[PDB]
Design a protein around this ligand. Sequence first.
Ligand code: CLA
Ligand code: CLA
Ligand code: CLA
Ligand code: CLA
Ligand code: CLA
Ligand SMILES: CCCCCCCCCCCCCCCC(=O)OC[C@H](COP(=O)(O)OC[C@@H](O)CO)OC(=O)CCCCCCCCCCCCCCC
Ligand SMILES: CC1=C(/C=C/C(C)=C/C=C/C(C)=C/C=C/C=C(C)/C=C/C=C(C)/C=C/C2=C(C)CCCC2(C)C)C(C)(C)CCC1
Ligand SMILES: CC1=C(/C=C/C(C)=C/C=C/C(C)=C/C=C/C=C(C)/C=C/C=C(C)/C=C/C2=C(C)CCCC2(C)C)C(C)(C)CCC1
Ligand SMILES: CC1=C(/C=C/C(C)=C/C=C/C(C)=C/C=C/C=C(C)/C=C/C=C(C)/C=C/C2=C(C)CCCC2(C)C)C(C)(C)CCC1
Ligand code: OEX
Ligand SMILES: [Ca+2]
Ligand SMILES: [Cl-]
Ligand SMILES: [Cl-]
Ligand SMILES: [Fe+2]
Lengths: 334, 341, 137, 81, 38, 455
Amino acid sequence: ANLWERFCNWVTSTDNRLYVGWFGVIMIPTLLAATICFVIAFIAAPPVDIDGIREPVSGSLLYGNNIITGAVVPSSNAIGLHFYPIWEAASLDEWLYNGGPYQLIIFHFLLGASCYMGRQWELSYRLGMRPWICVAYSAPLASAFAVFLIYPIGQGSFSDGMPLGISGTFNFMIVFQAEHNILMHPFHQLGVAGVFGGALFCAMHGSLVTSSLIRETTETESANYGYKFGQEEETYNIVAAHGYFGRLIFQYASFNNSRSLHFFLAAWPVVGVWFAALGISTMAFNLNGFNFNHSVIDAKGNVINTWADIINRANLGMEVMHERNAHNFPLDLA
Amino acid sequence: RGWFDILDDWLKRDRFVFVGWSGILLFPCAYLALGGWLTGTTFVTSWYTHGLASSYLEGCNFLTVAVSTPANSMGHSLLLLWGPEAQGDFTRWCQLGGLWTFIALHGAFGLIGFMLRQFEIARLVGVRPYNAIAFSAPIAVFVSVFLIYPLGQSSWFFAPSFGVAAIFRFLLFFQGFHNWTLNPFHMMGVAGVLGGALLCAIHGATVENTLFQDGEGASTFRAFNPTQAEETYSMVTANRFWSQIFGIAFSNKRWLHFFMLFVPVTGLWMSAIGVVGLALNLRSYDFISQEIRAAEDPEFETFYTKNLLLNEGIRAWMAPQDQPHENFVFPEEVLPRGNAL
Amino acid sequence: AELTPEVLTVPLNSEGKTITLTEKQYLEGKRLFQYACASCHVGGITKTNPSLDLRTETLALATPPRDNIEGLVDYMKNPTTYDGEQEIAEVHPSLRSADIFPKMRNLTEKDLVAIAGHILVEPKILGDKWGGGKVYY
Amino acid sequence: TTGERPFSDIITSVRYWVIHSITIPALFIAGWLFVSTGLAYDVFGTPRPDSYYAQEQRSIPLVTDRFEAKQQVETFLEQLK
Amino acid sequence: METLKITVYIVVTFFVLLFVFGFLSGDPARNPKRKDLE
Amino acid sequence: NSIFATNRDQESSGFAWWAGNARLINLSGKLLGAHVAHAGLIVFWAGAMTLFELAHFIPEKPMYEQGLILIPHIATLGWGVGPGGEVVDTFPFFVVGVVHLISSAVLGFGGVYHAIRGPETLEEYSSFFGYDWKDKNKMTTILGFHLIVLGIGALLLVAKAMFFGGLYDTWAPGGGDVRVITNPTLDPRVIFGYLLKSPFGGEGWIVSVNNLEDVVGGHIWIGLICIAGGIWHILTTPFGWARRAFIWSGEAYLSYSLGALSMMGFIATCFVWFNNTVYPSEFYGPTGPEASQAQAMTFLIRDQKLGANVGSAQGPTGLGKYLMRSPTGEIIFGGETMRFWDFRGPWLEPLRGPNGLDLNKIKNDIQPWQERRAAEYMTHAPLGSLNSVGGVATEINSVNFVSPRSWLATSHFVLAFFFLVGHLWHAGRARAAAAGFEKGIDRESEPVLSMPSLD
Ligand code: CLA
Ligand code: CLA
Ligand code: CLA
Ligand code: CLA
Ligand code: CLA
Ligand SMILES: CCCCCCCCCCCCCCCC(=O)OC[C@H](COP(=O)(O)OC[C@@H](O)CO)OC(=O)CCCCCCCCCCCCCCC
Ligand SMILES: CC1=C(/C=C/C(C)=C/C=C/C(C)=C/C=C/C=C(C)/C=C/C=C(C)/C=C/C2=C(C)CCCC2(C)C)C(C)(C)CCC1
Ligand SMILES: CC1=C(/C=C/C(C)=C/C=C/C(C)=C/C=C/C=C(C)/C=C/C=C(C)/C=C/C2=C(C)CCCC2(C)C)C(C)(C)CCC1
Ligand SMILES: CC1=C(/C=C/C(C)=C/C=C/C(C)=C/C=C/C=C(C)/C=C/C=C(C)/C=C/C2=C(C)CCCC2(C)C)C(C)(C)CCC1
Ligand code: OEX
Ligand SMILES: [Ca+2]
Ligand SMILES: [Cl-]
Ligand SMILES: [Cl-]
Ligand SMILES: [Fe+2]
């Protein structure tokens, strides 16, 4: 074997503690770059002129933030969608003022996470598994692409990408509601059903399997010792589990086929979250939530408010206040 | 022999819809809660309580219909049909928001009924009652949000109204008035929900992609038998995959499934605690150190101070229509607004 | 409340004469306003110049007065600046500029009267909302 | 099985559809007439399109008194001329 | 900055070539079952 | 006599009803049927939808005000329109619609025939039309036929542009008009220059194509490239390196095409959102950037009329209220639209000088048509609700409007995304199936059990 052959064998080796693989050859350096830049910026980066109006926003810990308020702040609105790597700046001081770290981090992250997804396909193939775990992960990945890349593209600026921080996230969400009425969008509604449903079914499945564990232990020990890693037999009685759930609702609302059950557990949150991601990704092109503002009118023509109109008042409050120094003209068009 | 045992026999017969002693509480309350909601959203107004149209009859759609809370002047009145407010007049009762307390209270007792059903069925079939235990989370949420919260506030008016858009309004109110996103109890709630959805997805996907070939079909669902003794998927292969991908993996199926109970259940319980604080306006609204710095230093700006400006917008712009009992008149000149917008 | 003949009675001219619009006339005016005008004048404001709205009191102080049917019809044929000083057909939809604003091309006298009627009636229904902008939504 | 006849057997039977070709349209029509006769408004106290406001007012008939709420609504309803 | 630009370009090119030549190096055969898939 | 008597069930095929079409993988006759009938559905829609559009079309009203997506495609090819995109004759739209709808009957006929009546497999009927997915030579041959077909289609665009009336040119001197393209760009440095440019701001990869000469010349290259590649594939068989690189099966080929179509979908999304040359704003409405720029233009015009010195007007932040500099110094519109300074459009370019927006031209040379267009575009920005309430999310009901650009961008993003999911699904499955473990792990031969422990 020549050197390249040995290298390919090591890269694709099923015996490495962490699998590398060809997707890993890209994933490893890109995620390390994103992580290192993120950590340094979150601690020590100076204020960033996010909205391109020479009004720098402090994101870092050393510049007066805590964990909750801190962020890596999006690149300047003056940049827009222009590619702003370190080498396009006259200096690191300029790069920092303009939000260069944000671009570096999100682009390495998105590439690295895309390769994380490929790597999941890759290892499944090396291990003789079925291939679709990566398809499930495509849901959160799609959501990350939506807020870091697709939304910026549609709006014309990475200044409108989700900030890399806890309060910055909430900011993004509130502005998004003002500008898209996302709550009233059926794809976000499907998202909510996906995550509420996912959490419900997580709890349900967990509770039902736990409820039907076969007695293998005494009272003075954890029931978990009743299962041994790699044992051939099932550790719970699925017939008992089904007999309970079928009676809780009615016989036919209960899964007796564990394969069908586990497919449903995969599909429900994954499909819901694909829709969430498509919500953000289509609201990126300003096809927005339902608008029933003044939809109900009386015999004379008086507006009869509904809860939609109350939502609209809250949205207006967000709209008129956000980026209070950035707008010179009456309409917020991006 | 003996009417009680005879009744017990009949209540616990294996029929299509199990009844049980629990059913005596559950079925009427759940039916009335659901029927209350359908009735109100189809036919009933919120004109006299909120100045709002809220039914299909008035022209609302599925997203905008609601059964709305009673007027603030009702305080925390039980608002019983026969009580001193409606005085047995069904029409007036509807107009005063009586269907809101109807649905909330019947809904609460129905939830008690459902959890009792979970206990009753588990006892009869002979399984451990973890499903009932898990259900404590939905109960903590309902009780904290629909009962405790308005009970700490001025009146039921400020409870959530039962409707799609109405619930959205509740979210936005909590942002603008409570800064609820900043609350670490809500944050833990978010973690449990998103973490629960994550676990649901990843576990479902993992099982489906580590299945043993137990048939010749390309569609693999047929190759499972409810009575089979063998695991349908490989725990050993699953463990190796995740150990190599993510660094850690489950090795114990019982721990795995208990953790799936633990995460979303704990998350919901944490969010309930935060809402209990919000009943009292005991918010995580501010960071004092941030405010002292910002007040003294007009160049200091973070995402935290940016969000408070949004909140101030929300309060001033939504309050006069959202809180009509206050009779707010905010002249145009006092409304907070940035440039141009 | 309802859309009464009283509500539908609006000044025809500046000399004190009125017309009573039919319910049908009002609804056609609303439809035509949406069709040809609302892209800029939704809810009574003006998106490309928010300083000038379609409130009755504002129209009353325009030159020539625009707070009546005939004034509004004239505006739709030959629009002017607020002081009556410049003719603005070249940048504002009118019969005179129906060549460059094609949605004006087939509007009849009855159409303009209907649109004008809608403009005067709306504030009588909506109050401050008409010409008020987002504050009043 | 639970002892009752399967749903699929029931809803594919002639007896079922003979019964329900009568009862389903009947309930549907009764619902239609509950609304088309305007009875729905009267039962629930929901304003008709001409009953939100009196002709000139623009103020909501908001209930402001817990214990005289019944009377207040009645007063609001009288003020609709 | 010019030196940084070149350094990053070489680095990126290096890893991308690893990815491409890596997946060209008989990848379908790298599985625990049927290897002759060409 | 039995319900299981045919091969169209799980018992025979190994596939459940919900994966029913997987039963067709090795049934080339019924599979041909499915494909031709599907192509019929595509053509049917093109036909029926065009006629629906035309029936609803008020020709003097802008297209983008009328929920049209197909008539704008026909108009862009130069059919039915004159100066400024004015509709001069609706008959070419009628023809396109009718002919598609009639053609769909033929495809539908043949599709139904092959699907239920014709030979189920084609191999015993004909060695030309029959095929084995695993026959690499036959696969590249059919690929080759289709490459030539696609090459021809590209040359048909060229023919239309050069010999049959031209294309709608929004950039035409003196105003937008149908123009015959006589000098297509053939210089490969220009043509393949587009393919090598960054997809980021102010560059925009191929989406930046901004003149019909480049568009037409690009299709000359694509036409010939595809024809040459078609011939190449009919006359060759895959080299060793390619044989060892790919999975060779029907599902694998499906997966490759899914990844390709996903990529194209995402590209199309960006094309219709940003490009105003092959998607003329006269027909599709302004782009997001365009309408934002148009707002700034609108208030620059109004305030300047009132006496404002727009070049020296300092905004609240210190930046120019109307005019500022881009990061490389170009004079650009101010406010939030600073992000949109890469925007280019025929209503705006006359105000542009070497250093960007030219203050003298702004002071002296703005024409009433520019004011009208900026106003129109500002008030037709591609923002609107799902129920087609035009404007911002807080806007009241009144205007029935969602830009065709939004409909087309959102739809194609959704489709491109699910097609990526489809690619992953089928690529993973094809790999698993070729290797022999798509149905699960062999209990008697579990690969992980023969591997050393990780620790
Ligand atoms: C288990 C079923 C159930 C339960 C728990 C409830 C519960 C409730 N109902 Mg609902 N209801 C039900 C079924 C039920 N309902 C059904 C089937 C209907 C259709 C008829 C309704 C129709 C209805 C309406 C229209 C309303 C309610 C309302 C209420 C609330 C107040 C009830 C009240 O004050 O009762 C008081 C009475 C009791 C609690 C019964 C007490 C009996 C005691 C035990 C007798 C004492 C005997 C003693 C031991 C003898 C000692 C002798 C000694 C002297 C020697 C409460 C949430 C009200 C509400 O929702 O307002 C917002 C309301 O308006 N209900
Ligand atoms: C574009 C959509 C599309 C197309 C073109 C096809 C095509 C086909 N499928 Mg697939 N399928 C689809 C979607 C589609 N399917 C969907 C959505 C599902 C899930 C419900 C399935 C589930 C499925 C299963 C389980 C099976 C198929 C099978 C088949 C093939 C044989 C069908 C047969 O024997 O008909 C028998 C039915 C009839 C004779 C009834 C009439 C059908 C005709 C075609 C209707 C024509 C209507 C049209 C208006 C006529 C106008 C003609 C005019 C131009 C003159 C056929 C090639 C079968 C197979 O693979 O065969 C080996 C098979 O077992 N399909
Ligand atoms: C590229 C695809 C496409 C696009 C961009 C449009 C765009 C448009 N159409 Mg056309 N049309 C299409 C295809 C398309 N259509 C198809 C397939 C049909 C047959 C039904 C039609 C028939 C049609 C008619 C009859 C009309 C339109 C009209 C319109 C306009 C208004 C749209 C609207 O209000 O939607 C409302 C939005 C919805 C109904 C939401 C759709 C959401 C779907 C169900 C979810 C899709 C998600 C994904 C695909 C599912 C994957 C599931 C996953 C788990 C695997 C707009 C310009 C109207 C118009 O203005 O004409 C002049 C009009 O009257 N269209
Ligand atoms: C992908 C398209 C396609 C393909 C590859 C086939 C393939 C086949 N067909 Mg099928 N068919 C199709 C679509 C197709 N068909 C359509 C659209 C119809 C409706 C008209 C039919 C109706 C049909 C019938 C009734 C029969 C077949 C038969 C056959 C077989 C022999 C045909 C032959 O002898 O060729 C030799 C033919 C020629 C040399 C003449 C070709 C001239 C064409 C029409 C003009 C070329 C111009 C251009 C390429 C057309 C592009 C159109 C595009 C814009 C959509 C073969 C398996 C026969 C069969 O299966 O036997 C049992 C048979 O009886 N076909
Ligand atoms: C639908 C179109 C199509 C399809 C499916 C194929 C399919 C095939 N071709 Mg053909 N080809 C085509 C069109 C097509 N070709 C055309 C139009 C021409 C004329 C130019 C050719 C000329 C051609 C030649 C000379 C050869 C093939 C070969 C092959 C085979 C292997 C290809 C490969 O490994 O790609 C994958 C590509 C690589 C492994 C190289 C790396 C490419 C980089 C990393 C991707 C960069 C692209 C980037 C993501 C986006 C583009 C922008 C970029 C410019 C910056 C395969 C059977 C080979 C064969 O075996 O022929 C017998 C071969 O030698 N083709
Ligand atoms: C055909 C449906 C279109 C796909 C939609 C996406 C849903 C399925 C993929 C989820 C990914 C989960 C992660 C991998 C999880 C995983 O590994 O799954 C594995 C599971 C079983 O694998 P098998 O190998 O047995 O079957 C797949 C092929 O091999 C064919 O036999 O796959 C399926 O069941 C596919 C079923 C498609 C049939 C319909 C699916 C239902 C969705 C329909 C959409 C309706 C919702 C819209 C309303 C809002
Ligand atoms: C309150 C009250 C009461 C009662 C009542 C009731 C009990 C009722 C009922 C009721 C009901 C019980 C109703 C109902 C209903 C219903 C409905 C109205 C429905 C519907 C539906 C729909 C419309 C559907 C749809 C859908 C979905 C869901 C999803 C998917 C698809 C579809 C689209 C299919 C009483 C007398 C005691 C007393 C006083 C008060
Ligand atoms: C295989 C299959 C399938 C499918 C199918 C298909 C997809 C098809 C088709 C088809 C088709 C795709 C068709 C068609 C058609 C068409 C037609 C039939 C037509 C026509 C036309 C006409 C008649 C016309 C007329 C007119 C004119 C001329 C002018 C103007 C007006 C009008 C419109 C009147 C399914 C799923 C069921 C399943 C099973 C199997
Ligand atoms: C028409 C036109 C034009 C043009 C165009 C052109 C000239 C083109 C093109 C194009 C092209 C020329 C392209 C392409 C491409 C490519 C691709 C897309 C690729 C790929 C690849 C792949 C997918 C691979 C894979 C792999 C690897 C990496 C390794 C190992 C394994 C495998 C094989 C798996 C212009 C813009 C001027 C303008 C307008 C119009
Ligand atoms: O940067 Mn971030 O938030 Ca999207 O809208 Mn326009 O730009 Mn600004 O305002 Mn609204
Ligand atoms: Ca069979
Ligand atoms: Cl903000
Ligand atoms: Cl601005
Ligand atoms: Fe499980």
